[PDB]
Every structure is written in structure tokens, then in C-alpha cells.
């Protein structure tokens, strides 16, 4: 299945106070009104630049994830979990099974079967949103729970989603998965682009409202004029330039081109 | 500035908003022509027509009443004055009237005059004959009106001549 | 260009979009060909209206016919006179109608320190500026030099009287009624009651100076303009004021637009009723306009914080601070790149200190009108 | 640590969000920090000039 | 070494498109002067006697 986000997957795109001011910014966003999967319950998915990630339970199903280029030895990867008592970041070079799990006795972590080289370690209804980038050796991930009043159904509205964590890593990252805890005794994946964007902040510094500039002529005109009211008439907004495809070189005939065969082709 | 490369868009995205304020001055500029010609002609309510007759007591308006036979609807002396006058980023924008629209504000300038005096500018259009109106005007430069009447086929003879000097002068 | 079309967000969120001068064949419903350009997304009808937003060469459009629309505009109704040669119209009645007229007479003086501005309380830029002459001195002259104007902008539009003229206390002006124009002790600054609903619908080197005549100097101008000529008519302006009933100075006025006494004498009751029902609709009007003034106070604010942003550009650096060029940089390495602030810097000041020349032009010519109004139709019949 | 400037400093107010470091005015200049160590907010301005 | 040369250059065309900005501003407000003046003779020439 495919579903529709409406306004979701917007976060503080770093720290500095703020409030009552349209602020714009150019960085990487999920697009409004997007494509997102669905999943029901899983597989090996891309990164490729950033993700979006939500789920909705009450039980906690949705047990971290999985991180990397080849989710195995010979490189190197991260791997978030979270059994029943908190969450354990780790990274090392691992052996993780093709198809990767936790039980629910209640004996689990069928996960992986390595856990070499360890270069970094770590231990310690509902709405749960994420955030995952990955620039210039550091690992970010904004994150946001808000309570829903349905089950586990993508719903409407507008949440802003804070930073969490900063890892200083250095890990390559082309794919992901995810972590579910079996049955014995709902997600979606959007993708991030570079996108600008016009936020507007509350008095507190929230962010309360977003307008995204590239969706329609609307919108559009709204950044030109960084205000979210437009009164009635006519405004310039950008320009109109024809695309040229290849390249012909032309050129004039090979009349004295070049007699070689006389001193690479003599007879004495 | 730049011109199609990306090397220089990227540089000249260095100097901040100078080139946003040059583009809100020639906008305003824009702007400013269509409201001078606003202010200029369309300086009367409705569009007025002259009657089709054209006993204006031995005045004759024809070089300068419009043309029927002409896409443009121009007089013979709008006409004359008619025939005596893509890059890097440029462009010309094209006015909000059509100077066919200026030419039947003018029309009706006009035709609001020869059928009411100045009654058209103050409220309603309130007709009077032409002699009747000249003869008001004579009294307000101070003369008395039969100067007017006794003299109007003289007075409508030099009017005329006059009228033929301009093209002749144009 | 590309030039979007919008009825207002307060109202609809449909959009049409123009594409200047572009033959509307090669743009990438409702795609409709202009002497202008392709226009997408509203609908061409066959009706005229007057104008709402002008696209070009006769065609408007506006948000009425659900969608956006576009035709060619009204030039107005279609009014025939029944010209002949013995026929004439004359009027059995009149209305007294009352309109107004808004001019701006100044705008706000502003102060800058070159230095403060483009160095910053710093010695190594400030020395380095040393070497550019005198431009900051001229710049400086020229800001006082429009400072001084506004001044005397305002004191040739109000200071038209000599003595302050004040009103009898028992006001019986023949049935006129003056008392939403008149000053109120109970208000603000002792303004009148239509003075305030005017009066409520409109860092680092930087300074703004305050004007020299203050409010409450201005209101006492006009009441006292406006207690001389409603009991003085014309003569305050021309020597002595010289009292007169002011239903015997409406019939002089009658006289001098060609009607006789006897018609305001015998209507007086009627002309009376009309003035004042017409002054208690200016106030409703304001009350549910003030664009030009409005727009000079934009202009100026939209220019003095395009000055503000401009100090956190590089213009070709490694930073926009001086205590970052001053700290990763050893001095002979940082005169290069405070230099290429500097001359950024003065760019933008000096690119400010000339729109604002010619800004105050064009205020100075308004403020021009609008005192030889104040003579000619306060002061006098025109 | 890494803020350099001059001026009057201030009890503020204002509440960052918790892992904002400083605040910035609309045209862009610092206006609030946070002490590192006590993790306080802090208002700036310029030195009373003019 | 090319970023030196093309910063040269778009100054120099910066300049040049400042001076044309300037002037057509100066030329406008010339053009507004004499609009203003046919307006009032449309008036008063026109619609009444002077
Ligand atoms: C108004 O004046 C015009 C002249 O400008 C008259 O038209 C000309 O009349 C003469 C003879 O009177 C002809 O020889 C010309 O060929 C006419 N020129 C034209 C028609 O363009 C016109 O007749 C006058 N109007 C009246 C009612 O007499
Ligand atoms: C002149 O016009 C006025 C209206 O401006 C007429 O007075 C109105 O008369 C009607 C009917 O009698 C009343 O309902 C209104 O209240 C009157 N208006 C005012 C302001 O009093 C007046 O009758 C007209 N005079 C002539 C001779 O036609
Ligand atoms: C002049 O007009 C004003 C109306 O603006 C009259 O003042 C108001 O009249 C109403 C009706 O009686 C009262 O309810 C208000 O309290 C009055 N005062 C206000 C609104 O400030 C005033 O009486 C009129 N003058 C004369 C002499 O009739
Ligand atoms: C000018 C010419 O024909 N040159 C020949 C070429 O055609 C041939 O393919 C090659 C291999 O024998 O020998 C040489
Ligand atoms: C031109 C227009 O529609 N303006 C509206 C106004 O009528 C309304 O009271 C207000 C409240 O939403 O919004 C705006
Ligand atoms: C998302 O893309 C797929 C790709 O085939 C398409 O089938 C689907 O209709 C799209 N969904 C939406 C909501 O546009
Ligand atoms: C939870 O998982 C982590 C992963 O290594 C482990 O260290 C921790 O001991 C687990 N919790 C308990 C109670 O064993
Ligand atoms: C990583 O683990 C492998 C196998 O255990 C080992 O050969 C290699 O030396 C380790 N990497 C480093 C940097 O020691
Ligand atoms: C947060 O914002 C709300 C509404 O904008 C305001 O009432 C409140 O005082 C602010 N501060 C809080 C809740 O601490
Ligand atoms: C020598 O001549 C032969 C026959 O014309 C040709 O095949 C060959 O390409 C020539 N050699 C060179 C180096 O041109
Ligand atoms: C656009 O191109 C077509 C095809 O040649 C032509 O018929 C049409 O007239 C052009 N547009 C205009 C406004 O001339
Ligand atoms: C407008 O009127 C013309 C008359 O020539 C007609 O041909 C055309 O179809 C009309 N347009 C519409 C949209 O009805």
C-alpha cells in the first residue's frame, strides 16, 4: 500500500531560539502531500538521503532498527535496539540474520550472531515519529511522539519533531530495516529531499506552521512575499527558460589532412 | 550579471540582496506609467457620443472627431500624430491600455464638451447648443454676448481657418 | 517572467499564471492567449468590468465566476446627451457632497554612523577605512540635509495662521454641525473625533531623530485653521479676522459659484440636514483607505532593514564577523579580506543614502501640493 | 564558548528549547545566550551608545 | 585562479546595471512631473473655462 502525508516530517534545523518570525531555510525535507509506503506486520530498504519514519501501536511492536551499507561483516554498521528495558545504540561489525527479530519466557534477539570490532557503545493509541540523516561523519535523528486518538492509521495535522542524538561515527550508510517483536505467547518510510521551506515561529519559539515552497503557484508566491496572507493582484515569482539538449559541433572538410603514408610506409 | 553559467550564480549569490532591490525599483517604475496615464485620461464617467448631425452653429470639428472608417477609430489629426513618432534578460512589458482604449477616452472628452459645456465635469451632462455655450464664454473673458452673435458666421470662418492651419502646420 | 495571479488567501485558493510574452504553444483547462503572454488557469468571458488586476493590454481579471476570470475592461457606462439646436437642461435641485483627499507631508529622519556601520568598534577596520577619503562625511551631509526638509515640510502646511483662533463656547452655526471636526478635551492629545480614527488605522549605528513640531502642536494647527474659517470665512487669511454668520458666509459662498442668495436662504434647513448627514457618513467609512500613507511608512521600513541584512553577507570572504577574521588570520592576511568588506559595506550604505534622496523628491513635491491646498482651498474659494 | 561580542548582559525570561544555545533577532543578531554552566538565559544588548 | 577573474567581472557589471537603475529612477520622476501638469490642464483647460 501507499499512503499520503499531509504535513509531516518537519524539524528545528538546529538549535538558536526563536520566535514570531517566517523564517525560511533550504535543507533536506520530506515533500508535502508525498508518497509514503505502507508496511503491515520486514525488508531491506534504501537510504539514499534521509528518512521519515512513523508507527503507531500501544503494545511496542517497532523495536529499532538497523542501519548500514551491507548489514554484515567486511564493513561496518550501527544498530539501535530496545528490549523491555532501554535502548542499546551500538556499533561494531556484525553477522545480522537475513531475516532479524526479538522473541517475546519472553527470550528473544534472534538479531544478529556477531558483534566484532565494537567501535562505539551505548546502553542505559501512539505516534512515534523519526528523523534519520547522516552528514559529514555525524548521525543525526530528530524524533517526536505525539498521541493519536486511533489505532494504527496515518493521521492529519502539524508536529514539528526535535533533535534527539548526535553520533561522531564516520559510518557509511545505502540501507536499512527494521525490528519487530514476535507473536509466541503499521509503518511508513518517506525520503528526504532538498527542499526550502518557510516556517513560522510561535512566541515560545515552537513551530507552529510550514509552507512549502515548490508545491504550487500559491506557495510559491507566499515565499516571494514571506507572509502567509496574500491579498488579491499579480506579483514576479521567477523565470521561464527554454532547456537546450546536446551539443552539435560542426566544422569544415579534411582537405590536407596529412600524407603519413610516405614516411611510415616507404620501400626503402 | 552571470548569464547561463553556475559559477557565477553562486558567487554573486554572495553579495546579499542587491539584486532584489533593483527589481523592486524597476517594478515600481512599471507601475508608475500606467497610473500617470490613468490620471491623465480616464477623467470622465461615461463615454459620451456626439449626435448624428452636426449643426454646431457653423463649427466644424470633423479633423478632429473620430474616423468610422478605421480599425483604430482615430481623427484625421490623432492620425497624423501617429505617423511622426529579445536580449540578456531585458524585457518590455506592454502597457495596460490599448491606445485604442486612450483614443475612445479622448472621443468622449471631447463629445462631452461640444454637446455640454462644463456641465459634464461637474456632475451630469447637461446639453446646451454650441452658440449658447460660446456666447457663456465670451462673458467670462469679458465680453459682452452679442459681440457673440452678431459676428458668428465671422467667428465660425476663422475657428475653421485655424483648425485647417494645425494639419497644415503638422 | 513568470507573474502569478492570486483573488486573495482571505477568499479562495485557486491561482492562474502568467507567462510573459511567451506564445502559450511552448509553456510546459484554461489556456488562453494574451498580447501579454499565456495566461493558465482562469476563464475567458465575454462580459467588461471595471479593472481589478491589470494583466496588460486591455485584459484584467478578477476573482468572481468559483474561478478566476479575464476580459477586456470598462472604460465606463454609456451616457447619451440629447443634443439639438434649441434644446437646454437645467437642475431643480442639488446635494452638498463631501469627500476627502489624504497627502503625505513627511517621513522619518534617520541617522547613521559610517563608522558604527561598517567597522564596528574596531581599529584595525576603522584604520583601514581612513584610506577611502571622505565618503562617510558626505554621506552624513546628505542624511542631515533630508533630516532638516521634513521639518520644513511640515511647518509650511500647518503654520499658515498667526494667532491661535479658538471656537465660542455656545456653537450655533444655522443648523451646521461641526462637532465630529472640532477638538475634544476628553480625548487624546485633544485631538477631534475623526483626527483618531486616523491616528489608529496607520541598533548599531542607526538612529532615528524625532520631529520638531509634535502632535499635539499639529491639532492645535488645524483647530485653530478650522475655528477661523467657520467663523471668519476668508478674511483670516488675507489680514484681521473679521467675524461673520456663517449661514450669511454660505450665501456668499452660493454667489461665488453662480447661485443666487435667496436659493440657500429659502433651503437652509434642507442644505443644513445634507451637510450633516454627509459629514456622519465620512465617519463610517473611516471607522469600517489610508494607502498613501501607509506606503511611505513600508517604503522606508522595507529599506532600512534591507540596510540591516546586508551586514551578514561576505561579499567574497571567509566570514561576515571581523572578530572571525581577526582570529584565524594573521594581520597581513587580514587587511585582504576587511577590505572586501569595506567595500561591500559602503556599496549598501551608499546605494541607501541615494533611494532615499530620491524618495524625499517626491515627498517634498507632495508636501508642496498640499500647502498651496491648504491656501487655496482652506483659506480661500477655489 | 565560541560567542564573541560586546555589551550589557541580562536576566531574561525566555525559555530555549533544551539544546539551544543562543537566540537571534529578525535581521539576524545575537540577542539571548545560555550560560554553559548554569544553563541560564541571558539577554544581550549594545553597549548604551549613540 | 578563474573565481578571481569572474568576481572582476560581476563587479563591473553590477556597477553598470546600478547606473542604469539610478538613472531610470531620476528619468521617471521627470516623466511623473509632466504627467501631473496635463492632468491638471486636462482639467482646467478642458472640463472649464481658465
Ligand atoms: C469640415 O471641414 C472639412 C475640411 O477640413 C470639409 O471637408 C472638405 O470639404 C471640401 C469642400 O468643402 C472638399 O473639397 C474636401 O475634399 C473635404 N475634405 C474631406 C471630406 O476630407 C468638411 O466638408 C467640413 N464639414 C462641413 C459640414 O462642411
Ligand atoms: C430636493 O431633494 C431633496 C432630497 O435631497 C428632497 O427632500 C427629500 O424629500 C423626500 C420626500 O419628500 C424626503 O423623504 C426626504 O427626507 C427629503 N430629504 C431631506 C434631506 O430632507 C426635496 O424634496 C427636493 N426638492 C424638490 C423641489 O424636488
Ligand atoms: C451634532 O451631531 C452629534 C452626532 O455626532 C450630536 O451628538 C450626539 O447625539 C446623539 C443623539 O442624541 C447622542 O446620543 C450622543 O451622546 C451625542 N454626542 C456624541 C455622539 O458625542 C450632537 O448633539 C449634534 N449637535 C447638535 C447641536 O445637535
Ligand atoms: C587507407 C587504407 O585503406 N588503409 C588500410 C586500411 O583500409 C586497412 O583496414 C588496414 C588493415 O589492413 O590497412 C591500411
Ligand atoms: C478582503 C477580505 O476578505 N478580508 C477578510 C476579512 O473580511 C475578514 O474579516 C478577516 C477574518 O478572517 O479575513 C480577511
Ligand atoms: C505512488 O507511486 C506509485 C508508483 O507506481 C503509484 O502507483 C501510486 O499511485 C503513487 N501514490 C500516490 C498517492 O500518488
Ligand atoms: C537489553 O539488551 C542489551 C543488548 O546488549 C543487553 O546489554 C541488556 O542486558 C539487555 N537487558 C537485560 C535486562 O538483559
Ligand atoms: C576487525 O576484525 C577482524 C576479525 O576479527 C580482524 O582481522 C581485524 O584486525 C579487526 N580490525 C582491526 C582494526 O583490528
Ligand atoms: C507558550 O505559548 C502560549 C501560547 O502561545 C502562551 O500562552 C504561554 O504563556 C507560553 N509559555 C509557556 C506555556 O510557558
Ligand atoms: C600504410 O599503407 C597501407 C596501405 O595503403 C595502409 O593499410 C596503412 O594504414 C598505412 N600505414 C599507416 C601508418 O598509415
Ligand atoms: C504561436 O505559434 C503558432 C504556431 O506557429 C501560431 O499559429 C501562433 O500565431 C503563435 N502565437 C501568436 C500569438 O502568434
Ligand atoms: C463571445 O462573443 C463572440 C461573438 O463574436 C462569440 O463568437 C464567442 O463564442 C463568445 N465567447 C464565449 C465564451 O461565449
Not at chain 1, 238 to 250: G, K, L, Y
Request: hydrophobic residues 40%; glycine residues 6%.
Amino acid at each position: 500500500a501507499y499512503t499520503n502525508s499531509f504535513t509531516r516530517g518537519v524539524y528545528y534545523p538546529d538549535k538558536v531560539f526563536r520566535s514570531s518570525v517566517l523564517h525560511s531555510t533550504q535543507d533536506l525535507f520530506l515533500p508535502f502531500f508525498s508518497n509514503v509506503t505502507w508496511f503491515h506486520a520486514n525488508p531491506v530498504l534504501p537510504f539514499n538521503d534521509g528518512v521519515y519514519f512513523a508507527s503507531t501501536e500501544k503494545s511496542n511492536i517497532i523495536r529499532g532498527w538497523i542501519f548500514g551499507t551491507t548489514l554484515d561483516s567486511k564493513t561496518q554498521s550501527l544498530l539501535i535496539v530496545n528490549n523491555a528495558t532501554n535502548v542499546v545504540i551500538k556499533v561494531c561489525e556484525f553477522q545480522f540474520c537475513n531475516d532479524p527479530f526479538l522473541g517475546v519466557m519472553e527470550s528473544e534477539f534472534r538479531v544478529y550472531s556477531s558483534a566484532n570490532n565494537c567501535t562505539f557503545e551505548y546502553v542505559s493509541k501512539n505516534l512515534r515519529e523519526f528523523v534519520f540523516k547522516n552528514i559529514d561523519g555525524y548521525f543525526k535523528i530528530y524524533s517526536k511522539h505525539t498521541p493519536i486518538n486511533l489505532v494504527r492509521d496515518l493521521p492529519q495535522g502539524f508536529s514539528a519533531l526535535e533533535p534527539l542524538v548526535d553520533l561522531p561515527i564516520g559510518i557509511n550508510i545505502t540501507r536499512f530495516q527494521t525490528l519487530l517483536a514476535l507473536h509466541r505467547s503499521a509503518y511508513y518510510v518517506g525520503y528526504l529531499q532538498p527542499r526550502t521551506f518557510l516556517l513560522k515561529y510561535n512566541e515560545n519559539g515552537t513551530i507552529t506552521d510550514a509552507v512549502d515552497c515548490a508545491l504550487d503557484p500559491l506557495s510559491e508566491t507566499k515565499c516571494t512575499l514571506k507572509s502567509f496572507t496574500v491579498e488579491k493582484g499579480i506579483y514576479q515569482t521567477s523565470n521561464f527558460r527554454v532547456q537546450p539538449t546536446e551539443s552539435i559541433v560542426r566544422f569544415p572538410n579534411i582537405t590536407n589532412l596529412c600524407p603519413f603514408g610516405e614516411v611510415f610506409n616507404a620501400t626503402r | 550579471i552571470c548569464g547561463d553559467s553556475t559559477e557565477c550564480s553562486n558567487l554573486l549569490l554572495q553579495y546579499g540582496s542587491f539584486c532584489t532591490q533593483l527589481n523592486r525599483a524597476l517594478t515600481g517604475i512599471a507601475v508608475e506609467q500606467d497610473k500617470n496615464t490613468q490620471e491623465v485620461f480616464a477623467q470622465v464617467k461615461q463615454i459620451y457620443k456626439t449626435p448624428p448631425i452636426k449643426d454646431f452653429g457653423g463649427f466644424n470639428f470633423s479633423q478632429i472627431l473620430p474616423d468610422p472608417s478605421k480599425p483604430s477609430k482615430r481623427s484625421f489629426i490623432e492620425d497624423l500624430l501617429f505617423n511622426k513618432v529579445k536580449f540578456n534578460g531585458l524585457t518590455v512589458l506592454p502597457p495596460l491600455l490599448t491606445d485604442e482604449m486612450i483614443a475612445q477616452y479622448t472621443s468622449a472628452l471631447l463629445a462631452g464638451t461640444i454637446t455640454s459645456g462644463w456641465t459634464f465635469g461637474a456632475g451630469a451632462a447637461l446639453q446646451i447648443p454650441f452658440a449658447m455655450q460660446m456666447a457663456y464664454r465670451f462673458n467670462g473673458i469679458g465680453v459682452t454676448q452679442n459681440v457673440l452673435y452678431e459676428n458668428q458666421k465671422l467667428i465660425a470662418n476663422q475657428f475653421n481657418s485655424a483648425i485647417g492651419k494645425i494639419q497644415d502646420s503638422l | 517572467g513568470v507573474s502569478v495571479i492570486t483573488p486573495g488567501t482571505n477568499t479562495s485558493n485557486q491561482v492562474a499564471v502568467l507567462y510573459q510574452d511567451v506564445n502559450c504553444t511552448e509553456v510546459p483547462s484554461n489556456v488562453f492567449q494574451t498580447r501579454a503572454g499565456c495566461l493558465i488557469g482562469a476563464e475567458h468571458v465575454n462580459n467588461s468590468y471595471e479593472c481589478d488586476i491589470p494583466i496588460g493590454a486591455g485584459i484584467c481579471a478578477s476573482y468572481q465566476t468559483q474561478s478566476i476570470i479575464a476580459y477586456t475592461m470598462s472604460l465606463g457606462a454609456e451616457n447619451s446627451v440629447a443634443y439639438s439646436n434649441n434644446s437646454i437642461a437645467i437642475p431643480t435641485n442639488f446635494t452638498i457632497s463631501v469627500t476627502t483627499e489624504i497627502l503625505p507631508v513627511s517621513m522619518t529622519k534617520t541617522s547613521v554612523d559610517c563608522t558604527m556601520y561598517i567597522c564596528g568598534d574596531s581599529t584595525e577596520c576603522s584604520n583601514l577605512l581612513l584610506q577611502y577619503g571622505s565618503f562617510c562625511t558626505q554621506l552624513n551631509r546628505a542624511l542631515t540635509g533630508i533630516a532638516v526638509e521634513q521639518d520644513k515640510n511640515t511647518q509650511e502646511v500647518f503654520a499658515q495662521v498667526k494667532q491661535i483662533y479658538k471656537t465660542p463656547p455656545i456653537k450655533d452655526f444655522g443648523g451646521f454641525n461641526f462637532s465630529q471636526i472640532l477638538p475634544d478635551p476628553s480625548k487624546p492629545s485633544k485631538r477631534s473625533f475623526i483626527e483618531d480614527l486616523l491616528f489608529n488605522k496607520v541598533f548599531n549605528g542607526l538612529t532615528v531623530l524625532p520631529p520638531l513640531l509634535t502632535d499635539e502642536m499639529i491639532a492645535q494647527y488645524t483647530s485653530a485653521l478650522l475655528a477661523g474659517t467657520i467663523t471668519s470665512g476668508w478674511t483670516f487669511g488675507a489680514g484681521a479676522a473679521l467675524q461673520i454668520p456663517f449661514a450669511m458666509q454660505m450665501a456668499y459662498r452660493f454667489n461665488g459659484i453662480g447661485v443666487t442668495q435667496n436659493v440657500l436662504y429659502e433651503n437652509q434647513k434642507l442644505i443644513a440636514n445634507q451637510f450633516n448627514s454627509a459629514i456622519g457618513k465620512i465617519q463610517d467609512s473611516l471607522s469600517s483607505a489610508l494607502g498613501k500613507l501607509q506606503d511611505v511608512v513600508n517604503q522606508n521600513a522595507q529599506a532600512l532593514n534591507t540596510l540591516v541584512k546586508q551586514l551578514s553577507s561576505n561579499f567574497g570572504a571567509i566570514s561576515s564577523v571581523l572578530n572571525d577574521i581577526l582570529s584565524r588570520l594573521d594581520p597581513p592576511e587580514a587587511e585582504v579580506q576587511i577590505d572586501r568588506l569595506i567595500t561591500g559595506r559602503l556599496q549598501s550604505l551608499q546605494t541607501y543614502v541615494t533611494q532615499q534622496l530620491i524618495r524625499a523628491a517626491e515627498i517634498r513635491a507632495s508636501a508642496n501640493l498640499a500647502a498651496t491646498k491648504m491656501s487655496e482651498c482652506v483659506l480661500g474659494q477655489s | 564558548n565560541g560567542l564573541t561580542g560586546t555589551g550589557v548582559l541580562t536576566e531574561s525570561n525566555k525559555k530555549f528549547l533544551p539544546f539551544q544555545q543562543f537566540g537571534r533577532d529578525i535581521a539576524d543578531t545575537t540577542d539571548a545566550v545560555r550560560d554553559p554552566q548554569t544553563l541560564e538565559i541571558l539577554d544581550i544588548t549594545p553597549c548604551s551608545f549613540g
